[PDB]
Amino acid sequence: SHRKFSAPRHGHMGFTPKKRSRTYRGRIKAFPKDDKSKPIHLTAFLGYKAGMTHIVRDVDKPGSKVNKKEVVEAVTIVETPPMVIAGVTGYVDTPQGPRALTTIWAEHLSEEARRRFYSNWAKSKKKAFTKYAKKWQDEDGKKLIEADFAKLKKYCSSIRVIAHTQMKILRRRQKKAHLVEIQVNGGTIEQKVDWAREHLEKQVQVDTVFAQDEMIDTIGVTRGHGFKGVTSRWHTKKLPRKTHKGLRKVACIGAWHPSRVAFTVARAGQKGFHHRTIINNKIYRIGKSALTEEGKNNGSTEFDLTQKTITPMGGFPRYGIVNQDYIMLRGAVLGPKKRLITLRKSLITQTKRVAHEKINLKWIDTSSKTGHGRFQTTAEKRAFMGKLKRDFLAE
Amino acid sequence: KFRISLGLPVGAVMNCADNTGAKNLFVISVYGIRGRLNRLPSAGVGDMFVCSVKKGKPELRKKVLQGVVIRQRKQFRRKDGTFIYFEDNAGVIVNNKGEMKGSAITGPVAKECADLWPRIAANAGSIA
RNA sequence: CACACCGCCCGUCGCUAUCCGGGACUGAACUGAUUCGAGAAGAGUGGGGACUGUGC
RNA sequence: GGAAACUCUGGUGGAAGUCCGUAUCGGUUCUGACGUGCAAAUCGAUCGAUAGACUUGGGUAUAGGGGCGAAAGACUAAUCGA
RNA sequence: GCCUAACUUCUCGCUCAUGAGACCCCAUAAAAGGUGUUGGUUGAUAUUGACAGCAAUCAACUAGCCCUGAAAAUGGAUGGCGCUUAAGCGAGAGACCUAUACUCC
RNA sequence: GCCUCUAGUCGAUAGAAUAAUGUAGGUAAGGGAAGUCGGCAAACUAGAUCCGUAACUUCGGGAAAAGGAUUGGCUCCAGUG
RNA sequence: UCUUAAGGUAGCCAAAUGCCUCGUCAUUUAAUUGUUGACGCGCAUGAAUGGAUUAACGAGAUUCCUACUGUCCCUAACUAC
RNA sequence: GUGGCAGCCAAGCGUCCAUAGCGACGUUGCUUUUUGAUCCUUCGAUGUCGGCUCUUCCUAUCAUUGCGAAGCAGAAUUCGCCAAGCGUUGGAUUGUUCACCCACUAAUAGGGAACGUGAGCUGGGUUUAGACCGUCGUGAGACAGGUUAGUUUUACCCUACUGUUGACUUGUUAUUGCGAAAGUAAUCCUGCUUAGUACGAGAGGAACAGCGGGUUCAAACAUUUGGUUCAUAGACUUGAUCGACAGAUCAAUGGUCUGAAGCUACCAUUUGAGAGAUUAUAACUGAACGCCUCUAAGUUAGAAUCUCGCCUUGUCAAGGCGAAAAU
RNA sequence: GCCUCGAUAGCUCAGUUGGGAGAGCGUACGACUGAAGAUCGUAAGGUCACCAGUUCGAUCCUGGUUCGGGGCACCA
RNA sequence: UUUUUUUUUU
C-alpha cells in the first residue's frame, strides 16, 4: 500500500557507509587535470584548522543589494607552514590503471619525516633510510639513482612529489611529520622531473601553490561524534511521546517482503569522522608568518591600522598560536580545531562570478574566542580599563 | 530579499498596526510556501500571508484577508552582521497587489519590508 | 334590528400589507462612569554645575 | 426603626451523612514503571473520601443447588454461571 | 554448441525484431493494421514499343516469417549462458547418445 | 513539608567509564494545540491581609466565583491586662 | 369512508432513542460528519415499563473561550540509574 | 461477473467538416488498487481497521526536461510521444479508507510491497465480560441499530541490516599508492532586464541569453546570535544547624539572577558541478519505385532518461595490484 | 460516481403500437345585474426540455446534453 | 322532538 503522503528520503545514500574514515589524513581521490602549457606548479598543500573568526569586507557585486556595502562574514584560519619536498615518484599507465614505477628519495631526510615510518621512534634504533642515504655517495648507487630518474623521465605519464610537513617549528607536542604525494602540473614530463629534482630537500611555501581570491577544495575527516541513534545520525522524525520502548527510532524498518532489512534504511551507528571533500572555498587572504617582518602584523588590513597578528586575544582556543603562514578561507571547514586539512586546487573550470570576485578586507576580528571578547588587543584592553591593583602593587 | 529567520508559523496571532479597525491578525498561510510533510508555513518581516481578523470591527471578521508582516519578535540577522528584533509581532492588511487597505501605521516598519513594499514604506512613520 | 330576521353578528382557518414582542448566539455597535496597572508633560523640592563674575 | 405587625444593624454561639487538608481508608489517569517482575496484582506520580451509610482487632452466627450480596453472577481460603 | 552423454554433421528455403524466436499438457493473447520481405490468385496494359522524367508495368486480393496493437509493482528468466547463411522458423538425410523397457549371460 | 537533638542506621555485590536505546528528573529562542480520536502528558493557579464578586437559585447556595492590591530587613509609634 | 379494547393525550426530540442521514435552517470556524438553538407524519419519543424541568454536587460523557505550555513546527542540552 | 483501464467500424456532434477533440448502435481486449464467486492452504492460533513513522517499487504522467498535433495568433488550455530522475504540501469535521471544504503551490497523479508496516507505536473503531436507549420477544434474551467504560506480553537465539575489532595466506614491521567491484544527488521557482518589447484594432501579453535571490533536498561547521548549566563558576536568598561575627553545610539539583567551555538550531553560518553514446523528434545525402521519400546502406543535432566523471566504501581467494624503507 | 425516474400552455397535471397534443387554474370577450362579485358560454392557452437516430409515420421507442427528484456506495 | 345560513354598494 502506497504511503499516504509523499516525503523525500532522509539523507544522501551516496555518502554511505557512515563509517569511520580508514585514515586520519585526507586522501586526494583526484588531482586537477594537467595542462602541459602552464608553468610547473604544485596542486595541493597541507595545513591545520586553527580556528574561526569573522571579518568585515566591502562587497563588489554589481546588481546585488549589498553592492558597495560592508558585510560581516565568518572565516576559518588554516595554518600552513612551508612543506619540504622529500622524494619524487611517477606513474605509468597500464590496462588496469596507473601504477607507481619508482620513487627517488632525497639524500638527507629530516628526522621528523623519518618518524612517519615508525610507531616507537624513541625506542627504536632509527635505522630508516640509513643504507639508502649512502647510495647517493656511491658509484653504483649513483648509477641506480640516475637510472631511476631516467625511467621517470622516459616512461611516466604523471609525476608526484612526496612532500612532508615540518613539525618542530610549531613548538607543539607532535614531532612525527605528515607525508603526502602531490601531483605536479604544467610542463612536460621531463620538465616536471627536472623541477622535482631541483626542489628535492627544499621548502615550498603556500603562496606558491595558492593565489588570493581563488576557489580551492578541502579534503579531510569530519568531526567525530561516536555511536549515535537514528534521530541524530539520519535526522528522522521523532516518534510520539506515548511510544513504548523508545521514540528516538525508526518505526518501520521494512515491509514484510523482501523479508530482509534493506541497506537504505536508517540505523544507529557511527556519526562523524567521515572522509569528505568540500569544494569551492574561497581564499580571503594568504598571510605571512608572524615571526617575519612581512607578517609582523598579518592581522591588520589597509584600513585597520592597528598592529596585530591573526591570533585572537588569548590564543586560538584548544589550538595555540598561529606563527606561520596561514590561509583565511570563507565559511566553515571540515573537522575540529588542530585537524589536518588537505587543500587541493579546484578540478572545475571556475566560471561563476563569485570565483573571480576580488575580496577586500576592511577589518579582522581578533577578540578573545573564550567568553565574549570586548577588545581587539591587550594594549586596547589595558588602555580602556586603566590600571589595576596588580599594577599598583607592582609599582 | 535575503533570507531571514522566520518566527511566525501558521496559527500565530500578531497585532494589526494600521487604522483599518482590526486589532489582531491570525496567520492562516504564507504566500510562496510549498512546504514539506509536517512543516508549518512560517513568515518573517516583509512576507505576505493569508490571515483572518480575530478581534476588531465586525465587518473585517469571519472573512479571509491578506496581510504583510512589518515587525517580528524573532531576532534576525542583517547582512551587516547585526541581529535585530522588535518588541512585538505586527502586520498590516493589504490587497492581493500590495496596496494597503488602511492609510497609517503605528510604530516602526522593518527595512526588509519597506524595501519590498513601497506603499507600506510610504505609510510608515519610522523605518528600522 | 331600521337595507328592519332573507336583520345583525362571533371566533378558528387561508391570502396580502404592516407594527410589535420572545429568541440560541458569553450576539454586535456607540457612549458615560469606577477600581487597578502603566504613564507623557508641567510645577515643587533635593542634588548637579556646562558657562562666567568676584574661597565666595 | 415602627401606631402595630414586624423590620434592620453589630456581636455571641458552634449545627451540618458541609468544605480544604494530615494519619488513615480507597485505587481515577498516566492506558507511566515492571510485565521469564520486588510482586501469581506490586511500584511512582496524579487522584476519591477523611467525624460518619466512617475505619478497624478479637469473640461469635450463616456451609454448597447452600450461605451472603447498597446487585458486579459478585464473594464464599490465589478455586465460583454452583 | 557449452552446462550435458551424443554433430558447431549433410540439403533446400524463410526471418533482422532499439532484448526476434526457440518444441504436448504448459504455464495467456484478440478485433484490427504495415508500400518490411517472400511466395501465390485473379483482372488488365505492354514491343501496332507498357508505367516515371521533362522492358515489363498497373490494380485488387491472398498467406508464410517479421513489425504495431502489447501497461505493474524486490532483480530475473526459451532452464542458464549464449545463438543471427543460427545454437531461430518449416521440410528432410545420415549417424550418434540414453531407462529399472527388449534380447542374451 | 524542610532542617536538627535523644535513640538508631550507612543494610540494600562492588570498581572504572559516562556510546546508542531506555527509566526518572531539569530546561528551552519565536509561535502557542498548527500535534492528537481526544490538550493524553506537562505547564499554568495557590499561603495570608485588604478590596471586589455575575447568571441562576430549592433563598441555604453559587463563592476561594470572576478579578485587583499588599507581603522582606531594620528603627520606631499606637492599642489591647 | 374503513376500522380498534383504546387509536399516543400533556409534553419532548434527529436526543445515550431518527434507518434514510454528514436531515434542513441558524450559531460557533478561514474551513466543521463536531457543539448549541430551532423544525418535526417521530424506520422505532411519551407520561411511576414514569414525562418535562431542575439550584447544589460529580476521579461521569461532550463542545467552546481564556491562561498555559516541547503536544507540535523541530529538535537540542543537562542530571541520576 | 462487477470495478478500473485501453482498442476496432464510423451514425452523428464539432458554424461547413465522421476521425483537431469526441464518438452512438455494436464489438475486441487488458488489470487485479473494488466487490463478488470458490473453498485449495492455515482452526494443538499467520495478532484481525485506521492513523503515525520509514524504505523501496510500478507506472495507466499531475508537475518538471526534450518533443509532435490542435477548432495552437499569447497567462492559460487540450491531445499524444520518449520518459518514473525528482517532487507531489498546511489544515477544519469524521476512528474513519473515502468524502467535503479552507489555503498555499511547479503540482497538489494513481497505485503495490501478507488490503507493506502492533515482540515498531497508538487503541479512536471493531471485537468478551459492566451499563443505558429504541425496536423485537411471554421470557431468558437478540439486533453490520445508537451510547459509555473496558490488561496491547517476550528477543539475550539464527539470519538480514547498522556500525566496531580482526586473525591465516603471498617472510616480518611500519610508510606511501592504483582501481576492480559496490554506492552515488540535486530540485523547482522567481525580483530586475529582456519588454509593456515581439504581436496587432484593441483588450491583452510572452519567451532564450544576462544579473540578484529563494524553496525542497544534501554535506559540514560554531566566529557571531540563540538554547542547554551538578563548570555544582560567581552573586543573592528562605528554613535549619555549627554559641555569635566570619566561614560553611543540609533541603535526593532548596530556590532566583548571570553564566564561560563543550554540545547544538534554516533559530546562526558555509558548500552543492562536467562529459559520452543516444531516445522521442527534427533533418542531410539517397535508392527501392528512372519521380518522390529522414531509411533501406550511410550521415547530422538531440534530452529531468542511460553510462561515466566528481563524490563515499574499497579484510578484494585466480588470498586484487604497485613503489619504496629497515630487516 | 452507480441504479434509476421524470421534463407537456403563464402554473398544475392527462395522453398515446408511434397514426389527435387534451383537462383545470390563469387570460380576453359575451351573457347576467341598477352596477359589481359569483355563475355560465366562447375565445383559449403548446418549439410536447434539447439534439441524433430507428420507422411509411414518433410527444411516446433507442442513444447523448441540460435540469432536477428517490435510492445504492471500505473496514475490522 | 328537530328548526343551520342569506355576497359588495345603493
Side-chain angles (χ1 to χ4, degrees):
Chain A
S1 190
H2 68 283
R3 46 181 319 172
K4 211 168 193 227
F5 301 92
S6 195
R9 75 150 280 126
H10 288 288
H12 196 305
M13 276 291 318
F15 281 100
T16 64
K18 301 193 144 160
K19 73 161 43 157
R20 282 184 223 165
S21 171
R22 177 189 350 140
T23 74
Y24 159 93
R25 202 204 345 136
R27 299 156 259 132
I28 301 133
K29 317 275 190 84
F31 284 101
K33 190 158 146 14
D34 172 52
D35 181 25
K36 289 310 199 253
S37 78
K38 318 226 103 183
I40 289 132
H41 58 267
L42 285 194
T43 41
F45 215 80
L46 281 185
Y48 316 92
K49 181 177 155 178
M52 302 204 40
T53 175
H54 65 273
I55 59 92
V56 169
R57 76 182 176 97
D58 263 307
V59 163
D60 180 34
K61 201 177 324 193
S64 172
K65 218 158 181 113
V66 286
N67 197 21
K68 306 175 170 359
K69 261 76 183 270
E70 271 163 346
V71 307
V72 168
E73 301 215 308
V75 301
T76 317
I77 305 306
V78 185
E79 178 166 28
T80 59
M83 273 191 307
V84 177
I85 295 203
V88 201
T89 202
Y91 289 81
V92 55
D93 285 6
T94 80
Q96 302 103 5
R99 192 195 53 115
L101 191 56
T102 200
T103 301
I104 304 97
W105 299 91
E107 186 183 340
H108 315 287
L109 283 177
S110 156
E111 253 200 7
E112 28 184 36
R114 305 207 296 290
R115 282 174 170 264
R116 173 58 53 184
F117 288 77
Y118 282 102
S119 314
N120 301 114
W121 164 270
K123 202 179 216 212
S124 73
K125 315 280 301 289
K126 308 153 223 294
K127 293 289 296 253
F129 290 94
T130 46
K131 308 216 172 101
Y132 180 91
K134 303 160 182 276
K135 286 166 66 277
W136 272 84
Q137 312 276 325
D138 177 16
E139 299 65 334
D140 305 87
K142 276 254 75 192
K143 269 156 175 288
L144 290 179
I145 282 155
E146 230 59 20
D148 282 346
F149 275 115
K151 271 196 327 200
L152 283 191
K153 275 140 98 127
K154 168 157 186 49
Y155 294 117
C156 285
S157 42
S158 156
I159 295 299
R160 309 213 196 132
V161 292
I162 298 139
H164 76 80
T165 70
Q166 316 176 68
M167 312 295 288
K168 210 209 169 31
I169 60 187
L170 299 171
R171 288 161 224 158
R172 297 198 245 270
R173 177 180 178 106
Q174 190 181 327
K175 298 141 166 178
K176 194 192 298 220
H178 303 102
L179 288 155
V180 60
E181 272 176 31
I182 303 152
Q183 165 169 297
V184 193
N185 273 6
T188 72
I189 292 301
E190 205 248 18
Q191 307 191 303
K192 290 155 172 245
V193 171
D194 293 325
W195 182 95
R197 180 166 200 181
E198 309 318 330
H199 283 69
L200 267 184
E201 256 173 63
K202 297 222 183 343
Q203 297 189 7
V204 172
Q205 324 261 347
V206 75
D207 57 359
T208 78
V209 185
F210 297 114
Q212 219 251 342
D213 323 303
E214 179 186 330
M215 295 282 227
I216 66 158
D217 314 336
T218 44
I219 304 146
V221 183
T222 57
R223 204 160 38 97
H225 307 293
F227 205 91
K228 277 282 190 239
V230 300
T231 309
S232 183
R233 199 195 193 204
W234 287 100
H235 305 108
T236 62
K237 178 76 43 184
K238 289 188 12 175
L239 301 173
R241 173 201 75 76
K242 326 207 327 189
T243 315
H244 192 221
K245 307 135 127 164
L247 53 98
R248 304 186 53 95
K249 330 208 288 210
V250 162
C252 177
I253 62 165
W256 194 319
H257 283 119
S259 6
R260 276 165 316 288
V261 194
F263 80 118
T264 44
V265 181
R267 320 235 72 190
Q270 169 73 29
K271 188 197 155 101
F273 207 79
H274 301 318
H275 191 263
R276 293 293 185 261
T277 306
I278 323 296
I279 63 150
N280 289 352
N281 315 112
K282 171 146 256 205
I283 293 192
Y284 272 16
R285 173 187 270 223
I286 308 204
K288 315 283 313 203
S289 170
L291 307 165
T292 70
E293 280 307 287
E294 286 50 11
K296 201 170 67 265
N297 50 351
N298 54 17
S300 53
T301 76
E302 326 272 3
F303 315 93
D304 176 40
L305 282 319
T306 69
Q307 297 334 72
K308 62 191 209 160
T309 67
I310 195 64
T311 317
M313 264 194 74
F316 274 111
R318 271 152 63 228
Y319 178 78
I321 301 175
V322 171
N323 273 324
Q324 314 286 322
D325 313 66
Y326 71 88
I327 295 191
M328 164 172 318
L329 289 173
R330 187 230 180 147
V333 170
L334 42 73
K337 311 157 189 353
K338 298 182 302 270
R339 174 80 88 231
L340 179 70
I341 317 292
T342 315
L343 313 163
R344 193 198 51 200
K345 265 168 141 17
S346 151
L347 319 165
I348 301 172
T349 294
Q350 247 58 63
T351 52
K352 310 197 260 64
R353 284 225 181 141
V354 281
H356 317 291
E357 171 172 2
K358 312 247 195 56
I359 305 303
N360 215 27
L361 295 194
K362 317 283 295 322
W363 177 79
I364 306 174
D365 189 59
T366 45
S367 62
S368 162
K369 297 320 188 264
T370 290
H372 308 291
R374 270 111 57 112
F375 312 99
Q376 298 293 307
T377 48
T378 309
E380 166 178 353
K381 166 152 162 208
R382 279 169 199 167
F384 178 89
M385 296 225 330
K387 197 155 23 62
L388 306 172
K389 190 171 144 183
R390 195 192 282 118
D391 312 4
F392 289 150
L393 301 181
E395 295 144 66
Chain B
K1 202 235 269 182
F2 287 112
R3 211 209 97 248
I4 57 130
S5 324
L6 321 162
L8 281 149
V10 160
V13 168
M14 69 192 45
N15 295 325
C16 203
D18 64 338
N19 62 326
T20 53
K23 309 230 280 303
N24 262 354
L25 286 190
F26 173 86
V27 179
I28 281 167
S29 190
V30 190
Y31 278 94
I33 282 270
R34 48 216 207 200
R36 95 177 300 287
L37 195 76
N38 310 304
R39 179 174 289 170
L40 301 192
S42 264
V45 290
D47 273 3
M48 185 186 287
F49 56 95
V50 183
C51 71
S52 78
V53 177
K54 293 307 217 214
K55 177 159 44 200
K57 309 286 190 53
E59 319 80 41
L60 295 147
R61 312 200 29 241
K62 295 182 126 276
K63 69 168 42 57
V64 155
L65 306 151
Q66 280 111 72
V68 170
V69 188
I70 59 156
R71 305 190 290 268
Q72 78 184 48
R73 264 192 267 231
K74 177 67 190 156
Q75 101 268 7
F76 56 99
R77 186 175 177 286
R78 297 209 156 112
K79 234 53 180 161
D80 40 321
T82 70
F83 282 85
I84 189 97
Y85 75 95
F86 299 80
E87 282 168 299
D88 73 332
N89 312 286
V92 295
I93 300 176
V94 298
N95 74 345
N96 46 306
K97 287 234 81 206
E99 280 95 68
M100 161 165 342
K101 173 177 212 39
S103 59
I105 304 177
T106 312
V109 162
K111 258 214 70 72
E112 283 77 5
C113 177
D115 296 343
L116 287 186
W117 311 100
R119 314 253 49 72
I120 308 189
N123 295 348
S126 30
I127 284 184

